[PDB]
Design a protein around this nucleic acid. Sequence first.
RNA 1: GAGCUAGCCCUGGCCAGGGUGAAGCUGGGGUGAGACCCAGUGGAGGCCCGAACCGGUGGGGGAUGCAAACCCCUCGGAUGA
RNA 2: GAAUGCCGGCAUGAGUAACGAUAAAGAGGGUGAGAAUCCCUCUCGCCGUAAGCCCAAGGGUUCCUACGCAAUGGUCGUCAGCGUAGGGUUAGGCGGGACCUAAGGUGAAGCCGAAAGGCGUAGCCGAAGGGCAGCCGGUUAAUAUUCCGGCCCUUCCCGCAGGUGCGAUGGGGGGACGCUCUAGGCUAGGGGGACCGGAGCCAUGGACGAGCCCGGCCAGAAGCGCAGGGUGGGAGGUAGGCAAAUCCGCCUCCCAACAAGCUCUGCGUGGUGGGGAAGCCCGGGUGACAACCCCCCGAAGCCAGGGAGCCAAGAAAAGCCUCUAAGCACAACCUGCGGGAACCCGUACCGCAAACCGACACAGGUGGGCGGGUGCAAGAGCACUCAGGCGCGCGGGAGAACCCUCGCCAAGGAACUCUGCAAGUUGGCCCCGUAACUUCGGGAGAAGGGGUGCUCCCUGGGGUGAUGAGCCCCGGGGAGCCGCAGUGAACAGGCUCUGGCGACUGUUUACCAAAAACACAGCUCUCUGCGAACUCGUAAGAGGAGGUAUAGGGAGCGACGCUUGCCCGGUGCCGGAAGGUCAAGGGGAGGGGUGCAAGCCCCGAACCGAAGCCCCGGUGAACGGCGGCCGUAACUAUAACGGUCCUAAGGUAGCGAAAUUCCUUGUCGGGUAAGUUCCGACCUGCACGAAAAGCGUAACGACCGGAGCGCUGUCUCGGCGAGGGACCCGGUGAAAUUGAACUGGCCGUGAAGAUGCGGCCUACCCGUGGCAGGACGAAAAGACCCCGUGGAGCUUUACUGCAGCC
RNA 3: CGAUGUCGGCUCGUCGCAUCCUGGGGCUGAAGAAGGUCCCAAGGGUUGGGCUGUUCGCCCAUUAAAGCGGCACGCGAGCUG
RNA 4: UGGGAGAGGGUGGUGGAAUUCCCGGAGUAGCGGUGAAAUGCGCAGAUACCGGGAGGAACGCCGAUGGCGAAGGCAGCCACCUGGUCCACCCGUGACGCUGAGGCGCGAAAGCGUGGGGAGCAAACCGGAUUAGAUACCCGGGUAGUCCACGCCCUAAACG
RNA 5: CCGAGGGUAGGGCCCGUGACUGGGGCGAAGUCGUAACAAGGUAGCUGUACCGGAAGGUGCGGCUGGAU
Lengths: 275, 48
Amino acid sequence: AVKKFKPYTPSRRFMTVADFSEITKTEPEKSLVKPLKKTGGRNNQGRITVRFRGGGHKRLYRIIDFKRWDKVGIPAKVAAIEYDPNRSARIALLHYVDGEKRYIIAPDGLQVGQQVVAGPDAPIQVGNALPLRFIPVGTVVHAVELEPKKGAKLARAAGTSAQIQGREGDYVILRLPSGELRKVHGECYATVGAVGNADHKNIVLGKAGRSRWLGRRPHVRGAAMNPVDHPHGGGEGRAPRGRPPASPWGWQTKGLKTRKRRKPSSRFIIARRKK
Amino acid sequence: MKRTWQPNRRKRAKTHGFRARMRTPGGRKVLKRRRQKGRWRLTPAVRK
RNA sequence: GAGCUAGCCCUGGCCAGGGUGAAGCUGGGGUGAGACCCAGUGGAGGCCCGAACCGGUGGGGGAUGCAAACCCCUCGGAUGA
RNA sequence: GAAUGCCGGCAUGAGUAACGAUAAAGAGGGUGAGAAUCCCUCUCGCCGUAAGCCCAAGGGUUCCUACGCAAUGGUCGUCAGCGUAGGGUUAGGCGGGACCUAAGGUGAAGCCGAAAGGCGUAGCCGAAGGGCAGCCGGUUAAUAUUCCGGCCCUUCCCGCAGGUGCGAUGGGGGGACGCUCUAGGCUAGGGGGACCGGAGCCAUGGACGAGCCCGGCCAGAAGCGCAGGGUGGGAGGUAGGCAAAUCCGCCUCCCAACAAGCUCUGCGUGGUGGGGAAGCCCGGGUGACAACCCCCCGAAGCCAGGGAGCCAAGAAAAGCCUCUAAGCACAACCUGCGGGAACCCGUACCGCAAACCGACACAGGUGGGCGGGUGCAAGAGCACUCAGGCGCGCGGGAGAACCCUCGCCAAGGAACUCUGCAAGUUGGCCCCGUAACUUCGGGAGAAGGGGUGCUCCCUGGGGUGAUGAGCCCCGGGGAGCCGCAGUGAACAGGCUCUGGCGACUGUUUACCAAAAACACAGCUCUCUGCGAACUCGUAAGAGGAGGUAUAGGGAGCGACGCUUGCCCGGUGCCGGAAGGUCAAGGGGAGGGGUGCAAGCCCCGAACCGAAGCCCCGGUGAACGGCGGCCGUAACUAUAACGGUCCUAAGGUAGCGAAAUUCCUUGUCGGGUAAGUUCCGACCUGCACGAAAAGCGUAACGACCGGAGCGCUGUCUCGGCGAGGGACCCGGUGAAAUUGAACUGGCCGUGAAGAUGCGGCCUACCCGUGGCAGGACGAAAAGACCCCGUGGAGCUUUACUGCAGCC
RNA sequence: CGAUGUCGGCUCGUCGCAUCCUGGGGCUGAAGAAGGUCCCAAGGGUUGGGCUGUUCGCCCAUUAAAGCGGCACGCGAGCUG
RNA sequence: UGGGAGAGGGUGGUGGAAUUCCCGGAGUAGCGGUGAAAUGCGCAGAUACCGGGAGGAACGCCGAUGGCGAAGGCAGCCACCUGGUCCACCCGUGACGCUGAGGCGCGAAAGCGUGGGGAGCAAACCGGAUUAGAUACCCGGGUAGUCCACGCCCUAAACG
RNA sequence: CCGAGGGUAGGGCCCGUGACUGGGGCGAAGUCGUAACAAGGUAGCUGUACCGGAAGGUGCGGCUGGAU
Ligand SMILES: CC[C@H]1OC(=O)[C@H](C)[C@@H](O[C@H]2C[C@@](C)(OC)[C@@H](O)[C@H](C)O2)[C@H](C)[C@@H](O[C@@H]2O[C@H](C)C[C@H](N(C)C)[C@H]2O)[C@](C)(O)C[C@@H](C)[C@@H]2N[C@@H](COCCOC)O[C@H]([C@H]2C)[C@]1(C)O
Ligand SMILES: [K+]
Ligand SMILES: [Mg+2]
Ligand SMILES: [Mg+2]
Ligand SMILES: [Mg+2]
Ligand SMILES: [Mg+2]
Ligand SMILES: [Mg+2]
Ligand SMILES: [Mg+2]
Ligand SMILES: [Mg+2]
Ligand SMILES: [Mg+2]
Ligand SMILES: [Mg+2]
Ligand SMILES: [Mg+2]
Ligand SMILES: [Mg+2]
Ligand SMILES: [Mg+2]
Ligand SMILES: [Mg+2]
Ligand SMILES: [Mg+2]
Ligand SMILES: [Mg+2]
Ligand SMILES: [Mg+2]
Ligand SMILES: [Mg+2]
Ligand SMILES: [Mg+2]
Ligand SMILES: [Mg+2]
Ligand SMILES: [Mg+2]
Ligand SMILES: [Mg+2]
Ligand SMILES: [Mg+2]
Ligand SMILES: [Mg+2]
Ligand SMILES: [Mg+2]
Ligand SMILES: [Mg+2]
Ligand SMILES: [Mg+2]
Ligand SMILES: [Mg+2]
Ligand SMILES: [Mg+2]
Ligand SMILES: [Mg+2]
Ligand SMILES: [Mg+2]
Ligand SMILES: [Mg+2]
Ligand SMILES: [Mg+2]
Ligand SMILES: [Mg+2]
Ligand SMILES: [Mg+2]
Ligand SMILES: [Mg+2]
Ligand SMILES: [Mg+2]
Ligand SMILES: [Mg+2]
Ligand SMILES: [Mg+2]
Ligand SMILES: [Mg+2]
Ligand SMILES: [Mg+2]
Ligand SMILES: [Mg+2]
Ligand SMILES: [Mg+2]
Ligand SMILES: [Mg+2]
Ligand SMILES: [Mg+2]
Ligand SMILES: [Mg+2]
Ligand SMILES: [Mg+2]
Ligand SMILES: [Mg+2]
Ligand SMILES: [Mg+2]
Ligand SMILES: [Mg+2]
Ligand SMILES: [Mg+2]
Ligand SMILES: [Mg+2]
Ligand SMILES: [Mg+2]
Ligand SMILES: [Mg+2]
Ligand SMILES: [Mg+2]
Ligand SMILES: [Mg+2]
Ligand SMILES: [Mg+2]
Ligand SMILES: [Mg+2]
Ligand SMILES: [Mg+2]
Ligand SMILES: [Mg+2]
Ligand SMILES: [Mg+2]
Ligand SMILES: [Mg+2]
Ligand SMILES: [Mg+2]
Ligand SMILES: [Mg+2]
Ligand SMILES: [Mg+2]
Ligand SMILES: [Mg+2]
Ligand SMILES: [Mg+2]
Ligand SMILES: [Mg+2]
Ligand SMILES: [Mg+2]
Ligand SMILES: [Mg+2]
Ligand SMILES: [Mg+2]
Ligand SMILES: [Mg+2]
Ligand SMILES: [Mg+2]
Ligand SMILES: [Mg+2]
Ligand SMILES: [Mg+2]
Ligand SMILES: [Mg+2]
Ligand SMILES: [Mg+2]
Ligand SMILES: [Mg+2]
Ligand SMILES: [Mg+2]
Ligand SMILES: [Mg+2]
Ligand SMILES: [Mg+2]
Ligand SMILES: [Mg+2]
Ligand SMILES: [Mg+2]
Ligand SMILES: [Mg+2]
Ligand SMILES: [Mg+2]
Ligand SMILES: [Mg+2]
Ligand SMILES: [Mg+2]
Ligand SMILES: [Mg+2]
Ligand SMILES: [Mg+2]
Ligand SMILES: [Mg+2]
Ligand SMILES: [Mg+2]
Ligand SMILES: [Mg+2]
Ligand SMILES: [Mg+2]
Ligand SMILES: [Mg+2]
Ligand SMILES: [Mg+2]
Ligand SMILES: [Mg+2]
Ligand SMILES: [Mg+2]
Ligand SMILES: [Mg+2]
Ligand SMILES: [Mg+2]
Ligand SMILES: [Mg+2]
Ligand SMILES: [Mg+2]
Ligand SMILES: [Mg+2]
Ligand SMILES: [Mg+2]
Ligand SMILES: [Mg+2]
Ligand SMILES: [Mg+2]
Ligand SMILES: [Mg+2]
Ligand SMILES: [Mg+2]
Ligand SMILES: [Mg+2]
Ligand SMILES: [Mg+2]
Ligand SMILES: [Mg+2]
Ligand SMILES: [Mg+2]
Ligand SMILES: [Mg+2]
Ligand SMILES: [Mg+2]
Ligand SMILES: [Mg+2]
Ligand SMILES: [Mg+2]
Ligand SMILES: [Mg+2]
Ligand SMILES: [Mg+2]
Ligand SMILES: [Mg+2]
Ligand SMILES: [Mg+2]
Ligand SMILES: [Mg+2]
Ligand SMILES: [Mg+2]
Ligand SMILES: [Mg+2]
Ligand SMILES: [Mg+2]
Ligand SMILES: [Mg+2]
Ligand SMILES: [Mg+2]
Ligand SMILES: [Mg+2]
Ligand SMILES: [Mg+2]
Ligand SMILES: [Mg+2]
Ligand SMILES: [Mg+2]
Ligand SMILES: [Mg+2]
Ligand SMILES: [Mg+2]
Ligand SMILES: [Mg+2]
Ligand SMILES: [Mg+2]
Ligand SMILES: [Mg+2]
Ligand SMILES: [Mg+2]
Ligand SMILES: [Mg+2]
Ligand SMILES: [Mg+2]
Ligand SMILES: [Mg+2]
Ligand SMILES: [Mg+2]
Ligand SMILES: [Mg+2]
Ligand SMILES: [Mg+2]
Ligand SMILES: [Mg+2]
Ligand SMILES: [Mg+2]
Ligand SMILES: [Mg+2]
Ligand SMILES: [Mg+2]
Ligand SMILES: [Mg+2]
Ligand SMILES: [Mg+2]
Ligand SMILES: [Mg+2]
Ligand SMILES: [Mg+2]
Ligand SMILES: [Mg+2]
Ligand SMILES: [Mg+2]
Ligand SMILES: [Mg+2]
Ligand SMILES: [Mg+2]
Ligand SMILES: [Mg+2]
Ligand SMILES: [Mg+2]
Ligand SMILES: [Mg+2]
Ligand SMILES: [Mg+2]
Ligand SMILES: [Mg+2]
Ligand SMILES: [Mg+2]
Ligand SMILES: [Mg+2]
Ligand SMILES: [Mg+2]
Ligand SMILES: [Mg+2]
Ligand SMILES: [Mg+2]
Ligand SMILES: [Mg+2]
Ligand SMILES: [Mg+2]
Ligand SMILES: [Mg+2]
Ligand SMILES: [Mg+2]
Ligand SMILES: [Mg+2]
Ligand SMILES: [Mg+2]
Ligand SMILES: [Mg+2]
Ligand SMILES: [Mg+2]
Ligand SMILES: [Mg+2]
Ligand SMILES: [Mg+2]
Ligand SMILES: [Mg+2]
Ligand SMILES: [Mg+2]
Ligand SMILES: [Mg+2]
Ligand SMILES: [Mg+2]
Ligand SMILES: [Mg+2]
Ligand SMILES: [Mg+2]
Ligand SMILES: [Mg+2]
Ligand SMILES: [Mg+2]
Ligand SMILES: [Mg+2]
Ligand SMILES: [Mg+2]
Ligand SMILES: [Mg+2]
Ligand SMILES: [Mg+2]
Ligand SMILES: [Mg+2]
Ligand SMILES: [Mg+2]
Ligand SMILES: [Mg+2]
Ligand SMILES: [Mg+2]
Ligand SMILES: [Mg+2]
Ligand SMILES: [Mg+2]
Ligand SMILES: [Mg+2]
Ligand SMILES: [Mg+2]
Ligand SMILES: [Mg+2]
Ligand SMILES: [Mg+2]
Ligand SMILES: [Mg+2]
Ligand SMILES: [Mg+2]
Ligand SMILES: [Mg+2]
Ligand SMILES: [Mg+2]
Ligand SMILES: [Mg+2]
Ligand SMILES: [Mg+2]
Ligand SMILES: [Mg+2]
Ligand SMILES: [Mg+2]
Ligand SMILES: [Mg+2]
Ligand SMILES: [Mg+2]
Ligand SMILES: [Mg+2]
Ligand SMILES: [Mg+2]
Ligand SMILES: [Mg+2]
Ligand SMILES: [Mg+2]
Ligand SMILES: [Mg+2]
Ligand SMILES: [Mg+2]
Ligand SMILES: [Mg+2]
Ligand SMILES: [Mg+2]
Ligand SMILES: [Mg+2]
Ligand SMILES: [Mg+2]
Ligand SMILES: [Mg+2]
Ligand SMILES: [Mg+2]
Ligand SMILES: [Mg+2]
Ligand SMILES: [Mg+2]
Ligand SMILES: [Mg+2]
Ligand SMILES: [Mg+2]
Ligand SMILES: [Mg+2]
Ligand SMILES: [Mg+2]
Ligand SMILES: [Mg+2]
Ligand SMILES: [Mg+2]
Ligand SMILES: [Mg+2]
Ligand SMILES: [Mg+2]
Ligand SMILES: [Mg+2]
Ligand SMILES: [Mg+2]
Ligand SMILES: [Mg+2]
Ligand SMILES: [Mg+2]
Ligand SMILES: [Mg+2]
Ligand SMILES: [Mg+2]
Ligand SMILES: [Mg+2]
Ligand SMILES: [Mg+2]
Ligand SMILES: [Mg+2]
Ligand SMILES: [Mg+2]
Ligand SMILES: [Mg+2]
Ligand SMILES: [Mg+2]
Ligand SMILES: [Mg+2]
Ligand SMILES: [Mg+2]
Ligand SMILES: [Mg+2]
Ligand SMILES: [Mg+2]
Ligand SMILES: [Mg+2]
Ligand SMILES: [Mg+2]
Ligand SMILES: [Mg+2]
Ligand SMILES: [Mg+2]
């Protein structure tokens, strides 16, 4: 997991890459890919609305099945485990005995050639999807819907996972990857297991070009700009912030909470995130 | 060195052309003015 | 007004030749098994030398110019952000 | 009569600078009123990964011919991209359209917006991407994959034969894909041949030769051959592919498998049709019944959708094949053959440039393809040269200063100077050899060396082929030869030690700064639970992201190593259901105006009453800050120690005269003959110090210091030489500037620096080449400075307001 | 202030004399030699380096001596930067 | 061959007590702390008490002068994997033995790297007190660390 | 041809010396505290870590060479 390189260039000395061990098929399912429109950080007005985006590798989007509750009871076999450039996790190829093929994000431990299935009667086994109501308390879980039938929303990043802390009426108490304690409706589906590729965060990009390959253009510090451009702009020689550190748009960027006060979902967050 | 006028017939027609002018309210007032002035051509010539 | 310029998007194209010789793999040695070491194979890299191409470091010339930024000598990159 | 006035005319500078790359010219013969300049011939030179050829943009008749020379042409002109006229561009197959989709654009549905308009699913448009049928030669003054010839092919319509469950905008397959590296076999292209064809040639000492010189092919249907690509066959089940499905997907079984078969391309052959040199004679004719063969080299191109490896994980849609649906199965489709039909637009010419973009016939800029030969290790590098194209649209002289570009130089060798700036030196390949340090890769081409040609002899291995010859490719040893010199020309690093800064490759002020600045992997803080935060938008809607805390925003810092101390009083931010204040609103004690009154109307106390602020806490990789005086040791000096004042706390590790040190060239040491710089130390740090990070750090650097070796015209100190100018003659002929001028020196004077006033002195009239002291020389209504209740960018705890948020 | 280009260097000089040297001289606490001090004198001369942008200055090695100053802190339509 | 004892080792699972936090209730004027105090927490409702939840670390009694291991060391319970060892029978091989420079491996705690984890504890640090001072002992806080995985470090009054 | 050696260049070992700097030893009657020896007035020693004018202190683990 995570391969190193000998320092035969300045950049190889620190660069690391994934081991790609679990990957078993190296070209995507043609029936399940569609062209991804690279945005460059621009919106329909043509304006950069997220800065420092663009110019990365061409990618094809793999259609992922974030519902799984639309094929209740229909088992499937894990046919392959593949690279997906649109997310940190790996994806798994399912051959349903329907003959339908679908993609899911690969949980940790899921072995090619096993069966998976979804529904209240499903075995509490890695890769199976159940309504949260029916998963035993204490089970680690991933790809969790937030509202029933609206699609897997929580814990789909490499290595992430929620845990079931308890049950309260129609709502189960989840410990999200943030550390937040949230109530999620019991009818919401979730896949037992943690997301695989947990070594994803131990990758060292190694050089600037690697960031360029990911579609990540250079980020320029406020301090390096002029007052026209940024609160931190200007000054003769270097300058400290000289004011509470701020974004380009003037709002404070150290500590200033920004979650909407009167949001209706506050009724469902028990404890804000940890650390 | 590379100067500013790099002619391109498609670009010229799709930027200043008659149909480009008629799409937008500012563009139709250009044509309106240029008639009132009596311009011999309301629009740049481009040989297509 | 983005036919200059700046960024992004889509679709194409281009980068002589030469050098260095990563992982891996194979054989051998090593060991309880290993780690590992040796050779061969291999052909990695914002790797090296250098045209095209992209630049514009230093100096000279030019200065009612060949030119409203050019010329010469020199110099940077040249599979990559 | 003045406005650096406006328009126009004409002067001055002036027969002055210049006439646009220093690739280069000379003569002869034509033409003509006229010729350095046009035509022809011979000689000479220049480009040859181009300065040749073919496309695409753009340009728009510039193309071809005839007749012209006023202007355009930097001179000339008989010439021309100029003037006049006439002529010239031919396609089912090439390009685009009648096909497809990409970003994007537009947009029935729908959404949004005072209006204008903004969004937006399907659909539509949209190309240098996908798809699709023409190759070779000939012909014109000028077009040709277009005309003609030969041999091929496509689609549509109709018909005929055979065949089949036919039928689609619906389902499915396919199309359909990256980067690097790369196999086999071909082809393009090329080298050689003592073989084949050819008009000739024998010079000037030799050669009648296995001599020299020239050429030795191109296209081609079926078929066949070689080399590749693609592709399992069958059955049963079936709940998925939004109807259906015999297809596709999934499961099971049998058979075949690294083949074969089928199929598709490439190449070869191929009926046939073309081409065909030097030389000689006048673009042509002959050469010629031209010959058309053998060997070698050989792609980056072809087979191709080949193979392998890698991570950053690599369009779509149609054509095409398959499946069925309505409907139809006298139809329809498939296959073959036949006849018919096959439209629109482009087509001249320039196209790295005199026709494009630069006001110019402008040393600049402009995408793709071809780009031969020899040698130099390779190559598109370098020199020469083929095909082909040019000598750059002023010339002739002269042989001054001076300037440019260039060559050489005695002795010295950085003494030059801010600085080795500049220019030397070094320079390719092979081999020997190569240090500190290090992150073990590097440093490294370290440093420093030796070799390098030609001849003869012996010999090892590979490719091709046959295992052989021949050809070609890597080598090994031995003996010699010549010169000053053998990468004999051309292209091709000077090196070392030591500091600062930045880790690094990158990036930047287009047009004075490339850097130590920006970025950068990496570290930390912070926000964000998803209709996320954040951004753009009045909105709808977008981006974020078809992502989901290993994610996304923001901020600092900036590989890595070792680290990052104390202060939460103030500001910020976070937490705090109490308290205090607090607006609209609730409340209505108590008043007031008015009316005959019922009433109508106005004011209004306590009290209830949000955020915000106050208040209580937390918080530094949040904004930030991190003391003073006095005393004290058994020589002196210094002060571990003490006293006291203040603070929120009094700067810790490390570093230090520093990119920071004022005094300052601090002091001491090193280097030098001498060192305001440099390096190493000391520490009374004017005024380092820990993520505006502190201290280090291998490697990297067109960064900035210091030193040394090498070598030099940088210098002592200059000399000579070359070419392009300057100069003279012929042709063409600007410019800024200019109150007018008959425009001297000194000493004075003058608004305080006088050609112009005074006094003296000096001086015949006018030029030409030169030099720059003056004309407070030119240029630009001073950028500095001030003024203006002139302007703009920027900031904030200035004022006031607005967005946004609460 | 409708512009008088601003340090220093280089180059090129020229002038003043309050003279650094060389020439002439008086006084000396001048034995000689070598000095001191003042007077006359501007004809000529007045070095090469290290350091720093430097002028200046310090230093090395010499010298007869290593003078001071003016010329828009002489001299950028002469160069440097 | 048959047996036996054991905190010997490794992997995973899991059980209760306790501490801390958080929610709910009930309740009031103090709590805590010491030599005595102060700091601290507490009318914004603490302490004490009940129920609910979260999380981490350590395993009470058994337990001993005990057991195991070569040493360092090892203690809830369970399963798997695995080492040493003792005894009985006198069955097998027939000196196959002892030691052991180098080598290799293991090696408490602290410490280091990369992730996690973080209740209690607690270097550093802050505050209270003491004191001449108090960079200490004592008290209120408190960060690394203590815990897990992987990799290092290789020390010891590593002692009988 | 070899060849003393001379020259150019780069390495290794040793010695002497160096502004300044690090601790060490020693030195009749210096300054600061009082860490250790008694339970030395906090049992001591310890490996390590961090801190502190200084002895030392504190954490974690160990030892008794610990008083009762
Ligand atoms: C190459 C030719 C251009 O001249 C120059 O560049 C000169 C070197 C330029 O000087 C440079 C170089 C300089 C170092 O001084 C020598 C610097 O001081 C001035 C500022 O700028 C002239 C002297 C320079 O003039 C000097 O300017 C400074 C400010 C004041 C001087 N004055 C003191 C004499 C004057 O001589 C100017 C300003 O450059 C000349 C000015 C006439 C034109 N300036 C530029 C355009 O700017 C105009 C003003 O707006 C910026 O172009 C000029 C003039 C047209 C020229 C003549 O074309
Ligand atoms: K100023
Ligand atoms: Mg690595
Ligand atoms: Mg390594
Ligand atoms: Mg993987
Ligand atoms: Mg598709
Ligand atoms: Mg998008
Ligand atoms: Mg759009
Ligand atoms: Mg728009
Ligand atoms: Mg933005
Ligand atoms: Mg962007
Ligand atoms: Mg993801
Ligand atoms: Mg993945
Ligand atoms: Mg819900
Ligand atoms: Mg990382
Ligand atoms: Mg990417
Ligand atoms: Mg980034
Ligand atoms: Mg980035
Ligand atoms: Mg940045
Ligand atoms: Mg800035
Ligand atoms: Mg800036
Ligand atoms: Mg702006
Ligand atoms: Mg602003
Ligand atoms: Mg601002
Ligand atoms: Mg600022
Ligand atoms: Mg700044
Ligand atoms: Mg500053
Ligand atoms: Mg700045
Ligand atoms: Mg500030
Ligand atoms: Mg701010
Ligand atoms: Mg949260
Ligand atoms: Mg440009
Ligand atoms: Mg123009
Ligand atoms: Mg253009
Ligand atoms: Mg066009
Ligand atoms: Mg076009
Ligand atoms: Mg265009
Ligand atoms: Mg238009
Ligand atoms: Mg438009
Ligand atoms: Mg008209
Ligand atoms: Mg118009
Ligand atoms: Mg364009
Ligand atoms: Mg290249
Ligand atoms: Mg290259
Ligand atoms: Mg080489
Ligand atoms: Mg090799
Ligand atoms: Mg391999
Ligand atoms: Mg290299
Ligand atoms: Mg090299
Ligand atoms: Mg240049
Ligand atoms: Mg130079
Ligand atoms: Mg210029
Ligand atoms: Mg040039
Ligand atoms: Mg290079
Ligand atoms: Mg008047
Ligand atoms: Mg005028
Ligand atoms: Mg005027
Ligand atoms: Mg005028
Ligand atoms: Mg006028
Ligand atoms: Mg007129
Ligand atoms: Mg006029
Ligand atoms: Mg005139
Ligand atoms: Mg004249
Ligand atoms: Mg003149
Ligand atoms: Mg001129
Ligand atoms: Mg010229
Ligand atoms: Mg030239
Ligand atoms: Mg001649
Ligand atoms: Mg002639
Ligand atoms: Mg005539
Ligand atoms: Mg003529
Ligand atoms: Mg004539
Ligand atoms: Mg001619
Ligand atoms: Mg034109
Ligand atoms: Mg004419
Ligand atoms: Mg004429
Ligand atoms: Mg004429
Ligand atoms: Mg005429
Ligand atoms: Mg003319
Ligand atoms: Mg001209
Ligand atoms: Mg024509
Ligand atoms: Mg045709
Ligand atoms: Mg039609
Ligand atoms: Mg309108
Ligand atoms: Mg509209
Ligand atoms: Mg369109
Ligand atoms: Mg289209
Ligand atoms: Mg097309
Ligand atoms: Mg076609
Ligand atoms: Mg053909
Ligand atoms: Mg059929
Ligand atoms: Mg059918
Ligand atoms: Mg179909
Ligand atoms: Mg695809
Ligand atoms: Mg494509
Ligand atoms: Mg790649
Ligand atoms: Mg061929
Ligand atoms: Mg050849
Ligand atoms: Mg079915
Ligand atoms: Mg004939
Ligand atoms: Mg190519
Ligand atoms: Mg291909
Ligand atoms: Mg599409
Ligand atoms: Mg019928
Ligand atoms: Mg039509
Ligand atoms: Mg044509
Ligand atoms: Mg060119
Ligand atoms: Mg070209
Ligand atoms: Mg031309
Ligand atoms: Mg121009
Ligand atoms: Mg010309
Ligand atoms: Mg040839
Ligand atoms: Mg070569
Ligand atoms: Mg010429
Ligand atoms: Mg030329
Ligand atoms: Mg003459
Ligand atoms: Mg002359
Ligand atoms: Mg030249
Ligand atoms: Mg010579
Ligand atoms: Mg010389
Ligand atoms: Mg020298
Ligand atoms: Mg020398
Ligand atoms: Mg020097
Ligand atoms: Mg000089
Ligand atoms: Mg300089
Ligand atoms: Mg060379
Ligand atoms: Mg070495
Ligand atoms: Mg060394
Ligand atoms: Mg070194
Ligand atoms: Mg070093
Ligand atoms: Mg090394
Ligand atoms: Mg060398
Ligand atoms: Mg030799
Ligand atoms: Mg020879
Ligand atoms: Mg080189
Ligand atoms: Mg930098
Ligand atoms: Mg750098
Ligand atoms: Mg660094
Ligand atoms: Mg960095
Ligand atoms: Mg590069
Ligand atoms: Mg610039
Ligand atoms: Mg600028
Ligand atoms: Mg500019
Ligand atoms: Mg500009
Ligand atoms: Mg420049
Ligand atoms: Mg700069
Ligand atoms: Mg640079
Ligand atoms: Mg920058
Ligand atoms: Mg930066
Ligand atoms: Mg960096
Ligand atoms: Mg870092
Ligand atoms: Mg972090
Ligand atoms: Mg906005
Ligand atoms: Mg999206
Ligand atoms: Mg280090
Ligand atoms: Mg504070
Ligand atoms: Mg506070
Ligand atoms: Mg505060
Ligand atoms: Mg502040
Ligand atoms: Mg403060
Ligand atoms: Mg510290
Ligand atoms: Mg200093
Ligand atoms: Mg100092
Ligand atoms: Mg100093
Ligand atoms: Mg420093
Ligand atoms: Mg500085
Ligand atoms: Mg300072
Ligand atoms: Mg100073
Ligand atoms: Mg000094
Ligand atoms: Mg010295
Ligand atoms: Mg001092
Ligand atoms: Mg800061
Ligand atoms: Mg700072
Ligand atoms: Mg800071
Ligand atoms: Mg370094
Ligand atoms: Mg280094
Ligand atoms: Mg650099
Ligand atoms: Mg640089
Ligand atoms: Mg010279
Ligand atoms: Mg000459
Ligand atoms: Mg004459
Ligand atoms: Mg004339
Ligand atoms: Mg003329
Ligand atoms: Mg007058
Ligand atoms: Mg007059
Ligand atoms: Mg006169
Ligand atoms: Mg006066
Ligand atoms: Mg006067
Ligand atoms: Mg006069
Ligand atoms: Mg007068
Ligand atoms: Mg008069
Ligand atoms: Mg008078
Ligand atoms: Mg007078
Ligand atoms: Mg007079
Ligand atoms: Mg006179
Ligand atoms: Mg003259
Ligand atoms: Mg003058
Ligand atoms: Mg003057
Ligand atoms: Mg004047
Ligand atoms: Mg003047
Ligand atoms: Mg003047
Ligand atoms: Mg004005
Ligand atoms: Mg003014
Ligand atoms: Mg001005
Ligand atoms: Mg200014
Ligand atoms: Mg002023
Ligand atoms: Mg005022
Ligand atoms: Mg006023
Ligand atoms: Mg004002
Ligand atoms: Mg402004
Ligand atoms: Mg303003
Ligand atoms: Mg407003
Ligand atoms: Mg906000
Ligand atoms: Mg002035
Ligand atoms: Mg004027
Ligand atoms: Mg002026
Ligand atoms: Mg004398
Ligand atoms: Mg005398
Ligand atoms: Mg004199
Ligand atoms: Mg001065
Ligand atoms: Mg000085
Ligand atoms: Mg003077
Ligand atoms: Mg004066
Ligand atoms: Mg002046
Ligand atoms: Mg003065
Ligand atoms: Mg002065
Ligand atoms: Mg001056
Ligand atoms: Mg100047
Ligand atoms: Mg000057
Ligand atoms: Mg002058
Ligand atoms: Mg209270
Ligand atoms: Mg109360
Ligand atoms: Mg917890
Ligand atoms: Mg016990
Ligand atoms: Mg025991
Ligand atoms: Mg027996
Ligand atoms: Mg250990
Ligand atoms: Mg013991
Ligand atoms: Mg001798
Ligand atoms: Mg004593
Ligand atoms: Mg003690
Ligand atoms: Mg004691
Ligand atoms: Mg005590
Ligand atoms: Mg003690
Ligand atoms: Mg004690
Ligand atoms: Mg102290
Ligand atoms: Mg302590
Ligand atoms: Mg022990």
